[PDB]
């Protein structure tokens, strides 16, 4: 059939919970990256066939957050858009959907990624429409129930990370060591300007002044040490191993890529960043959802006819050190090539955006080191994984 | 390219607002129809490659509503699922994504549809994290803001219907006539048992008694007359034309179809209900979103190399009589072949499910009258349409 | 100092929970009875020195509910008013404060009573001003927390009634005979027109035609039998004696009397309903709050130099059969003189009003029988009692 | 009826909105002053006949806040208590009711005052019991609606201040100058230690450390100048005179006095702080509620047979400089004898407590300077005033 290529890539910086992006709605972050990614590609808004954006947390967001991002980015009304939710998989699954559509001949050019503002997620009042005839009622945190809580077992994602830690023998000390590594890798990449090219600024309005650009991954902890972690108390289970320091955060951000067939890029005179080599999803038991990247990455590698050793660089999302370590244990690949600029423990985890955020990061680093074969993969609440492989000439 | 077929199709009856389905969460509705479509197909749950369900209103619904439906339907954890939101387009867009993934080689068997419980939609409290230092605060109705309110113009979907009525000269009296036709057609279909085959029952628990089977479209008003409608006051604009009787309702329901390649159905010994001939989306100005089906249906017909006159049967969703009538005026096709068993004014409009609900109704009627060429289409809040054409041997 | 007289008495009928008064704010109910009590007394609004109304549930009620009722009853701005809260004692305590003011020469004519709309009580959101940075938050039922919940032991008034039943050996059977007696006596009183004179109609706006006059104690169960109660489940504790049928309900209503010195009444040419003989409060352990009426009634009788046997008629509130029966047990008086027209189990218990409601009922029955000596008393959540004795010449 | 005397007086320091007392519920503030006032007087908890506490904002506070203060202060269950609401009049009115009760013979020893935590007042959800079938709902601020908002005119207390400013010609300049005066007087009293004796410390738990003694009027702004006020935006009306600096604030605190007959204090060997000479209430138009102290103070002076010139010392509450100035203009009294240690503009205005707070301040300063004739008065939302005159031998 047809090869799919990525012609451009952009992300916002990732905001801390209640931080610099907390008052900017997720679609407005999405618009920043859709607009930037098209500019970078040299593609006019009217040439876009569709926009697909992941967003998990949509309570009170208004009709179709992806359409809002597309319109706010300047795209004309003739360009249709769809919002998707595959939890942390969303941002990457959008690119997968774009590739399916191009391959099927349903679309020519697709802007795909994800957008999330966890800070702005509201509380919801279940049963409000009916009323509360007697007795107390509950205001439920949508960020938790819709973003972070397993339906089937009724406990937090952090408990799934405890389950994975026990199953694969991932100790508290190894978690913390992995977490310090991520922070120091991120600090080192940040301090050396390595995130400069991939980040586009978001202008934050200021009461009686000009807006200020936000363009730094403010969640990254500089000068992080093992000692600053090894004393912390477990966050989710009193006898447990997972802490605030060895899990990712609650974060805000967006990321997008522009996708088209290789034949279309050549028709337009565009040199692609990379070819999409393969992609795959996978399902696992919700109890061990952090393991999804294993069967997903294995399926993606098999579709690519690659081995884990053929890879030059990977981005494997760090929702929890416990799960990222188990994944590395089970894949057997070389971890000096994974998250070389740090991961989500340091950078943050805006759930519906991360899938494309890590792809953006992967592509920019590949180019910088002239890596030829890369993979991005993430675990997914409710027991899934997605993985996508890219190849450079 | 690979031909994609639909091998089975099932819907719940549509519940009234606060009616028989009001306490059954949308993913339980989806489960009922996923499970029945697979039974009807003769496809085991472990054969399924992916589930894709639309659901618009997801506040407090828990992680990834489509996964919830899949798991509740008895599908194993290895089967991935994803939720989508293209407003009222969702349930039909789901089927489109399924066909894309089959044609691309990404999936083999997909269960695709939509699910919605508008009755259960809650209120949300924006700003609840920060708190309310002084003064009052708004509890926002998610059904309205997320389902029924245009972002760009900040008014109800009903005003977009008034815009269309004005633009296209659709009178109050023409709307009411249409609406009475739809109710009378739905009444005739009910009395004749036309919906018996497509409807699968939902068992409604009863306090100290056996569950009761809900299996009838309880929103349908039997004995509807013009005099019952022509006296009502307009619902959205005091000088307008759109009333509660010539617009659809707020409703609960779900619908699903099982999709696979023609080669796969042959291998499995399955006789399809139909082949998917073509499909398309479209964008239009949000102010006239009701017109979405015109460019969508023209693109789908074009892709099929059919003309409007080639069609034997259509299902064009009746969000508002005003928009359904403008769509017919612009397409110029034979309206005696449209919504022959009634439409949403009568049956209801569970937004995230409607696009698959109408597909289910189309396919069952096509089979009963031996129609060969069909089309389903819907408008979409924010200014879009989708359309899908099917063909039977 | 002075003899204090009651010149007039009026009450609304008592509304069922969510029933006929549920949409009428408490001060508007209080306005009804203040206006009516003054017309019945022959006292014009500008002669009033003060208005004192009990209201327990005042969340979102607006500034000073008693002043609202006074203004709404047509009293001029020059007449001050005060709201009080002694839980169920409130409505009677108002009368006691009125009589103190008069005896001290602080006031001349006082309208005193209480008003309550339990149906309209809202939920509150504690911590709302600081916000809920992460996690679920509680909407607290003000009816329960402010009206019905013991602060010190953190359980329902119904558990205090279980405590009383156990300590004084009041059995489930005793309680149910008491409760059926109350229903039957109320039904007989309604048939005899006993409440025709005391009740002031409240006009209730209707969907269609003219407002309907609400003027009947609609909570009273006609044709109640022992068999309808002896089989029910306990309402507050598995091992309990207290049920929905042997406790009163959640109710709406108001009541007021007009109070002044005997000398002021003769100077104005008015004939009193009765003279206030004495009154008292008392405190008991919160655990057995239902016994409050014992030390309160003993103190009032002692202040009157009367014996329990001197009484012709008593109104002793029946929040719970369990506590009313223990009160009777400890006082030793003839229970056939008590609540002769039925009590709160049948009529209902609008908490801030009930203390004057029962006095109103007492005074009208005393007149009709030409009884000479009476007493009203109530228990009070948090461990108190109030009692007040009246004499007719 | 003998004279009534005040044997002791105690208050907390006044907290700023969201300040040092913010997390201490009102009845706990109440408890501090009840216990202290009894200790100062030499009265054992079990000798108390009744506790009477003002508290305006009671939404979710639990049953009978006055009783809660009494029990928390260590008074036995046998001591009855009552909460009252006459808005800002509440705390002085409680003393008035205590005096009426002693004169009447009803009580012997009464603890009276008020308590308020405005910081902690929650939001309420009106109609929550019935639910919100469609459309947005409103969370309402109970501080504003129950404490600060005029029922009849539907506007803030600040607007009643603007009414008084216009009607009595009280300029923006005159108001800023008065306000600078109050702040400067309070500053000097803090440096001098004039409040040392009246204030009782409240221990604020620290999380990190031992609990800190809160014992200073932390709202007082030291170094206040005319220049810091004279350019501020009006806070309530655009064409207005009232600002955040010439009005008091939103505050937390409690105060109580112990009251008994002169004969009783002699029997117990107790030296009064003062004799209650007289007291009065009054009503005015809600629109001009700030003038309430005029007729209340004239009525109280009249019952005392005093003239305004007879007074050695006054405490007239400063809700708004606009009304305090109008009150002084109408009474004609010596303003250098009013609020000599500063007033509410500086000290703060915890509404249900302020009427006792100013009395506590009055009594301590009267003793310090050997003043013989004193008076305390405040305005009341909804159009009222209260005044109480005291006399030292």
Curated annotation (Swiss-Prot), chains A, B, C, D:
Changing residue 248 to A: About 40% loss of acetoacetyl-CoA thiolase activity. The condensation reaction is inhibited by free CoA. The cleavage reaction is characterized by substrate inhibition by acetoacetyl-CoA, which is partially relieved by free CoA. The active site is at residues 88, 349, 379. The keyword Acyltransferase applies. One of its GO terms (molecular function) is acetyl-CoA C-acetyltransferase activity. Changing residue 219 to A: About 50% loss of acetoacetyl-CoA thiolase activity. Its EC number is 2.3.1.9. CDD domains: thiolase. Catalyzes the condensation of two acetyl-coA units to form acetoacetyl-CoA. Is involved in the biosynthesis of polyhydroxybutyrate (PHB), which is accumulated as an intracellular energy reserve material when cells grow under conditions of nutrient limitation. Also catalyzes the reverse reaction, i.e. the cleavage of acetoacetyl-CoA, and is therefore also involved in the reutilization of PHB. This is Acetyl-CoA acetyltransferase. It comes from Cupriavidus necator (strain ATCC 17699 / DSM 428 / KCTC 22496 / NCIMB 10442 / H16 / Stanier 337) (Ralstonia eutropha). The lineage of its organism: Bacteria, Pseudomonadati, Pseudomonadota, Betaproteobacteria, Burkholderiales.
């Amino acid at each position: 059939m047809t090869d799919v290529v990525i012609v451009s890539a952009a992300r916002t910086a990732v905001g801390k919970f209640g931080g610099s992006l907390a008052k900017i709605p997720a679609p407005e972050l999405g618009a920043v990256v859709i607009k930037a990614a098209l500019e970078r590609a040299g593609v006019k808004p009217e040439q876009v066939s569709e926009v697909i954006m992941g967003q998990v947390l949509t309570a009170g967001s208004g009709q179709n957050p992806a359409r809002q991002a597309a319109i706010k980015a300047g795209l004309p009304a003739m360009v249709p858009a769809m919002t998707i939710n595959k939890v942390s998989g969303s941002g990457l699954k959008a690119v997968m959907l774009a590739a399916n559509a191009i391959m099927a001949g349903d679309a020519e050019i697709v802007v795909a990624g994800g957008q999330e503002n966890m800070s702005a997620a509201p509380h919801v009042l279940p049963g409000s429409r009916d009323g509360f005839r007697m007795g107390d009622a509950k205001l439920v945190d949508t960020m938790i129930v819709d973003g972070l809580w397993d339906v089937y077992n009724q406990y937090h994602m952090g408990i799934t990370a405890e389950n994975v830690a026990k199953e694969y023998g991932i100790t508290r000390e190894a978690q913390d060591e992995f977490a310090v590594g991520s922070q120091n890798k991120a600090e080192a990449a940040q301090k050396a300007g390595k995130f400069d090219e991939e980040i586009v600024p978001v202008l934050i309005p200021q009461r009686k002044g000009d807006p200020v650009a936000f363009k730094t991954d403010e969640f990254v902890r500089q000068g992080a040490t093992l000692d600053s972690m090894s004393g912390l108390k477990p966050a989710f289970d009193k006898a447990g191993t997972v802490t605030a320091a060895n899990a990712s955060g609650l974060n805000d951000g967006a990321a997008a890529v522009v996708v088209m067939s290789a034949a279309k890029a050549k028709e337009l005179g565009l040199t692609p960043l990379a070819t999409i080599k393969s992609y795959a999803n996978a399902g696992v038991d919700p109890k061990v959802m952090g393991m999804g990247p294993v069967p997903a990455s294995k399926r993606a590698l098999s579709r690519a006819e690659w081995t884990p050793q053929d890879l030059d660089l990977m981005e494997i999302n760090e929702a929890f050190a416990a799960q990222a370590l188990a994944v590395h244990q089970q894949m057997g690949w070389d971890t000096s090539k994974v998250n070389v600029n740090g991961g989500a423990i340091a950078i943050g985890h805006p759930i519906g955006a991360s899938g494309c955020r890590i792809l953006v990061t992967l592509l920019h680093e590949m180019k910088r080191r002239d890596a030829k074969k890369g993979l991005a993969s993430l675990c997914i609440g409710g027991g899934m994984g997605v993985a996508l492989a890219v190849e450079r000439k």
